[PDB]
Amino acid sequence: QRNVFRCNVIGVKNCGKSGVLQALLGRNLMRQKKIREDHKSYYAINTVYVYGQEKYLLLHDISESEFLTEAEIICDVVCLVYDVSNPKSFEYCARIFKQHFMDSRIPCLIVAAKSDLHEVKQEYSISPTDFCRKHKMPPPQAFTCNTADAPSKDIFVKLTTMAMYP
Ligand SMILES: Nc1nc2c(ncn2[C@@H]2O[C@H](COP(=O)(O)OP(=O)(O)O)[C@@H](O)[C@H]2O)c(=O)[nH]1
């Protein structure tokens, strides 16, 4: 029936959440810097085709906080973003997941953002891939909006599909 799926994008400050939203709007990192708006938008929506069917993904950029409200938790799919160049970024995703999403039926996708940069060891007891396995998530999906042309919309197809068939 419904073809608009809500996705909460979660991660530490400057882990690249805003970049993910802008990428859904077809803007790479270069154009994101050229753009100047009166106010930054923490929501973004765009068309996402799944199996030839027109769907829409509504992204909600959740700014970093030690605590999330039920308003920031309810969604069709959660996108946990960490920065491959920030060794402290994944711990936040893992903590938020266990605290708010582990005991729910909301599908979760982990995104390794800024994949264009050089990977560093994450300061967490578990590796990102092991964490996904333990909690029955897909593998961490590499992502970058730092491209010559429009960023790849692969993660958005994935997020939308996961939301469709929870
Ligand atoms: N190299 C690189 N830098 C990025 C990427 N995405 C964001 N950044 C930079 O990382 C910083 C934080 O990004 P932003 O999207 O504002 O993070 P947010 O605070 O989580 O929304 C900015 O200086 C961005 O230009 C990416 O894919 N690659």
In order, the DSSP letters of 108-143 are: EEEEEE-TTSPP---SSSS-HHHHHHHTTPPPPEE-
Q: What is the residue whose two structure tokens read 């897909």?
A: 138
Per the annotation, does 26 bind a ligand?
Answer: no
Ligand 1 atom closest to Cα of residue 145? 27
Separation of CA 120 and ligand 1 centre (Å): 16
CA distance 101 to 10: 11
Whether 141 contacts 24, CB under 8 Å: no
* CA of 165 relative to ligand 1 center, distance in Å: 30
Coil, strand or helix: which one is 106?
coil
What CA–CA distances, in Å, run from 75 to 113, 134, 144, 164? Answer: 21, 22, 24, 12
Span from the CA of 6 to the centroid of ligand 1 (angstroms)? 22
Distance in angstroms between the alpha carbons of the first and the last residue of the chain: 15
Q: Which two tokens stand for residue 145?
A: 């909006």
Q: How was this structure determined?
A: X-ray
Q: What is the DSSP letter of 151?
A: P
Give the CATH fold of the 1-166 domain: Rossmann fold (3.40.50)
Is 117 close to ligand 1, i.e. is its CB under 6 Å away? yes
Does the annotation place 16 within a ligand binding site?
Answer: yes
For residue 143, which atom of ligand 1 is closest to its CA?
A: 27
User: Distance, CA 106 to ligand 1 centroid (Å)?
Assistant: 26
**For ligand 1, is residue 15 a contact (CB within 6 Å)?**
yes
Q: Does 151 sit in the ligand 1 pocket, CB within 6 Å? A: no
CA distance 72 to 52: 30
Residue 164 backbone dihedrals phi, psi, to 5 degrees: -65, -40
Token look-up 């994101």 returns 32
Q: Whose CA is nearest to atom 22 of ligand 1?
A: 14
Domains of the chain: which residue ranges? 1-166
The annotation status of 147 as a binding-site residue, yes or no, is no
